[PDB]
Amino acid sequence: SQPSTANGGFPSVVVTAVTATTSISPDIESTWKGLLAGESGIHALEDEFVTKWDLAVKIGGHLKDPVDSHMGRLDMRRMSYVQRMGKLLGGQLWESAGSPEVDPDRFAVVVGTGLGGAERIVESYDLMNAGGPRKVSPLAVQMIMPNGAAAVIGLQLGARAGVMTPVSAQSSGSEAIAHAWRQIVMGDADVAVCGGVEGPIEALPIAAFSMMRAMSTRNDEPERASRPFDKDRDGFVFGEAGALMLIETEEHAKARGAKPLARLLGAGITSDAFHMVAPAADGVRAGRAMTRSLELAGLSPADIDHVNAHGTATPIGDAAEANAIRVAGCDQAAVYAPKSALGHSIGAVGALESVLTVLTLRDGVIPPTLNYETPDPEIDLDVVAGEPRYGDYRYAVNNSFGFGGHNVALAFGRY
């Protein structure tokens, strides 16, 4: 019969450290306290690029503490932005873990991102148009390539059991943690740094998503604009983030005296084959990704206390995900939609929300979904709102979905 975590057919895998930088704080613990106190990272954008172009979207969450105030002169010339973000979070995470001395040959890195060092593409293009091929940096290829942030972290921390970069648009950061889990349970690694990084809010990304008519334009009240599951939602809001976690076998963690924050029990990856940029309405394949993570974990849907929803606040996205949660039999879980406060960080967001799922399990508390004011009869979920919801949560699923029809669900447990 089928290997599961519960039946011992997969080894036990624990989360032993987390790190993130957000529009609320550069410190994940302070981001967590702010979320619980009802704080939002979303504000009026003050960038001159908003005025230069008169963008229809004038709201978003920049990082509280910009990555580049941490970067040396050479990093600014030799790395793309997602690489600098990767380096920053990778060193923070390692220090957080107690700087363990691990076997490099049993250590993997899996880090997702939406695009890569795309600013270096436009830089290279301009440099060559103005001055010819000899003006392109000899570092352009390694700064641009989308595996470049994962590679930087792997080099920095010494990972020799693989360095992988799954890209699946807005599920990339979750999918990275899924593949790290597979690398460990298939025997390829005992320890893995995983998660996601993403570029900052800029004019061209805004322009491109805005032309999809995907984004909230509630510019006069920025903190109220992101309303996942609310009746009056009008699209997503960008909120910058990067997040990594350290996962390892329980035996590896025990042998070095690490204190686990949670367990990572299983991962489901499916696809819709429905539309390139809208989720299937029926939620069936998305609900199957949740169900698969439960099969691998050895759990039933009634075990699931908590769902951390992808919850983008688009009208059709939230409706599809509500249907997916019912398909999976998880619609009596308490649901949190963290994009209500942190906005959408695209290739990083699944990793950020998996970190938040881990903290919910460690601490016994789910923050309030901001802006949740008018229940939507198509949604019919238990959306935590108003104040935090306390409980002894045993098991939780984190959802992420991505343009291309990608569905990723991760099942975590209390340690």
Ligand X SMILES: CCCCCCCCCCCCCCCC(=O)O[C@H](COC(=O)CCCCCCCC[C@H](C)CCCCCCCC)COP(=O)(O)O
Ligand Y SMILES: C=C/C(C)=C/[C@@]1(C)SC(=O)C(C)=C1O
From K ion, ligand Y, a copy of itself, none, which one binds at residue 279 (CB under 5 to 8 Å depending on kind)? ligand Y
Q: How far is the CB of 377 from a copy of itself (least distance, A)?
A: 28
Nearer residue to ligand X within complex by CB, 240 or 331: 240
Q: How far apart are CA 16 and CA 362, in angstroms?
A: 11
Binding-site string for K ion from residue 321 to residue 360, where x marks contact by CB under 5 A and - marks none: --------------------------------x-------
CA–CA dist 356, 362 (Å, integer): 10
Query: Which 3-state string (H, E, C) describes 60-120?
Result: EECCCCCHHHHCCHHHHHHCCHHHHHHHHHHHHHHHHCCCCCCCHHHEEEEEECCCCCHHH
Q: Single out the segment in contact with ligand X by CB under 6 A; choices: 118-126, 269-277, 282-290, 387-395.
A: 118-126
401 binds, among a copy of itself, K ion, ligand Y, none (CB under 5 to 8 A by kind): ligand Y
397 contacts 354 by C-beta, under 8 angstroms: no
DSSP class of residue 133 equals G
Among 61, 242, 367, 405, the residue binding ligand Y under the rule CB under 6 A is: 405
Give the C-alpha separation, 228 to 234, whole Å: 9
Name which position in 10, 32, 81, 236 contacts ligand X (CB under 6 A): 81
CA dist 194 to 110, 175, 368, Å? 5, 10, 27
The nearest distance, CB 154 to ligand Y, in angstroms, is 11
Does 407 help bind K ion (rule: CB under 5 A)? no
Query: Is residue 141 part of the contact set for ligand X (CB under 6 A)?
Result: yes
Closest C-alpha among 396, 367, 69, 148 to residue 262: 396
**Is the Cβ of residue 141 or residue 155 nearer to ligand X in the bound state?**
141
Q: Which stretch binds ligand Y (CB under 6 A): 21-29, 237-245, 300-308, 311-319?
A: 311-319
Given ligand X, ligand Y, K ion, none, residue 135, with its beta carbon under 5 to 8 Å by kind, binds none
Q: How far is the CB of 195 from ligand Y (least distance, A)?
A: 17
DSSP type of residue 13: E
Residue pair 6/299 in contact by the 8 Å Cβ criterion: yes
- Given ligand Y, a copy of itself, ligand X, none, residue 81, with its beta carbon under 5 to 8 Å by kind, binds ligand X
CA distances 175 to 126, 196, 255, 361, 399, Å, are: 34, 9, 28, 20, 10
> Look-up: residue for tokens 């597979």?
182
**Dihedrals phi, psi of 246, to nearest 5 degrees:** -110, 125
Helix (H, G, I), strand (E, B) or coil at 304: coil
* Mask for 179-218, x = binds ligand X (CB under 6 A): -------------------xxxxx-xx--x----------
Length of the chain, in residues: 415
Beta-strand pair 365-366/389-390 = antiparallel
Q: Is 143 in the site for ligand X (CB under 6 A)?
A: no
Q: Which does 314 bind (CB under 5 to 8 A by kind): a copy of itself, ligand Y, ligand X, none?
A: ligand Y
90 binds, among ligand X, ligand Y, K ion, none (CB under 5 to 8 A by kind): none
Smaller CB separation from ligand X, 81 or 372: 81
Can you give the binding site for ligand Y, defined by CB under 6 A?
A: 170, 214, 236, 275, 277-279, 312, 314, 317, 401-403, 405
